[PDB]
Paper text:
AP sites are then processed by apurinic/apyrimidinic endonuclease 1 (APE1), which cleaves the phosphodiester DNA backbone at the 5′ end of the AP site using its endonuclease activity. Upon binding an AP site, APE1 flips the AP site out of the DNA double helix and into an extrahelical position within the compact APE1 active site. In the human APE1 substrate complex, N174 is within hydrogen bonding distance of N212 and the AP site bridging oxygen (O5) and deoxyribose sugar oxygen (O4). To assess the role of N174 during APE1 catalysis, we rationally designed four mutations of N174: N174A, N174D, N174Q, and N174K.
Residue numbers in the entry: 43 to 318
DNA sequence: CGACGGATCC
DNA sequence: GCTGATGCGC
DNA sequence: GGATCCGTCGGGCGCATCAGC
């Protein structure tokens, strides 16, 4: 139950200082996270790119605080066409990307505001809020098709330029990514279909878990803890937030941090360092 | 989705 | 048009 | 009696719908 994140390695194995800092954070309501002081933490983090998930807020009700973010002025937003207070993603950046696409191509999937795709010269960054399987595993059939369609979309992106996937992938790949792995082997987040889903995505694009490459056998490292009861205090949680990287980016990986003590959601912020 | 408790092995 | 009471996804 | 395994339940968030003024 013990997890204090290691210190920030800001250099590469080749001695190269980190040039890039990406942050990803499911904000369980942008309008409820800004009031509980998350933009302040993001200002103490100084990310070059901030990727926000479950914003549940449309651009028209976008809080005004976003326009007082000085090193994060390029701001791209997605939302569901039908649902309000559902999903919603964000990409705030210091540099203006060459291209900002939204979605994954399959119109069926490009509806709930779950994917922003930003291209830069060295790399394409894709933020995401992957769909749940459901209480009762209802939309689990949907997830499996959605997965084939994201792994195929991202393989063709990685065909052109090195790829960094980040965000809430809604899956604990292995038993080290969750505290109670047996009580949830049939529950949402830890179904065998989705676990195999993750592994197929790692091999197909291909991709590597930024955290499990650097910390291969490090347990108790979680990114989400239920509001039911006091799971974050007894550290009962899951690792659903990740930094998936192209293999051609493992040489530039300095660190993948899980900022556990950053509050304001049911999720904690994850931060990446890269010498690119 | 963790708390909980039953329903089974030793 | 406000403002609490209740779904809904989770 | 417990170790374990597995099913059953019910209830913290944010938002936002719409009842009842
Ligand atoms: Mg959520």
């Amino acid at each position: 139950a013990l997890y204090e994140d290691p210190p920030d390695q800001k250099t590469s194995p080749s001695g190269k200082p980190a040039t890039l800092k990406i942050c990803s954070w499911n904000v369980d309501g942008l309008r409820a996270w800004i009031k509980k002081k998350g933009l302040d933490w993001v200002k103490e983090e100084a990310p070059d790119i901030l990727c926000l998930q479950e914003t549940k807020c449309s651009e028209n009700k976008l809080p005004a605080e976003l326009q007082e973010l000085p090193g994060l002025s390029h701001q791209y937003w997605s939302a569901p066409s039908d649902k309000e207070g559902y999903s919603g993603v964000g990409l705030l950046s210091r540099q203006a990307p060459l291209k900002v696409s939204y979605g994954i191509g399959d119109e069926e999937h490009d509806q709930e505001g779950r994917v922003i795709v930003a291209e830069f010269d060295s790399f394409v960054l894709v933020t995401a809020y992957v769909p749940q399987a459901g209480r009762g595993l209802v939309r689990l059939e949907y997830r499996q098709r959605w997965d084939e369609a994201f792994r195929k979309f991202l393989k063709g992106l990685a065909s052109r330029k090195p790829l960094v996937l980040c965000g809430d992938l809604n899956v604990a790949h292995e038993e080290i990514d969750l505290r109670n792995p047996k009580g949830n082997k049939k529950n949402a987040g830890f179904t065998p279909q989705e676990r195999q889903g993750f592994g197929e995505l790692l091999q197909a694009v291909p991709l590597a878990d930024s955290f499990r490459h650097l910390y291969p056998n490090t347990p108790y490292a979680y990114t989400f803890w239920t509001y039911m009861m006091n799971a974050r205090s007894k550290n009962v949680g899951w690792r659903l937030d990740y930094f998936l990287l192209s293999h051609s980016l493992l040489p530039a990986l300095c660190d993948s941090k899980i900022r556990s003590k950053a509050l304001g959601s049911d999720h904690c912020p994850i931060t990446l360092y890269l010498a690119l």
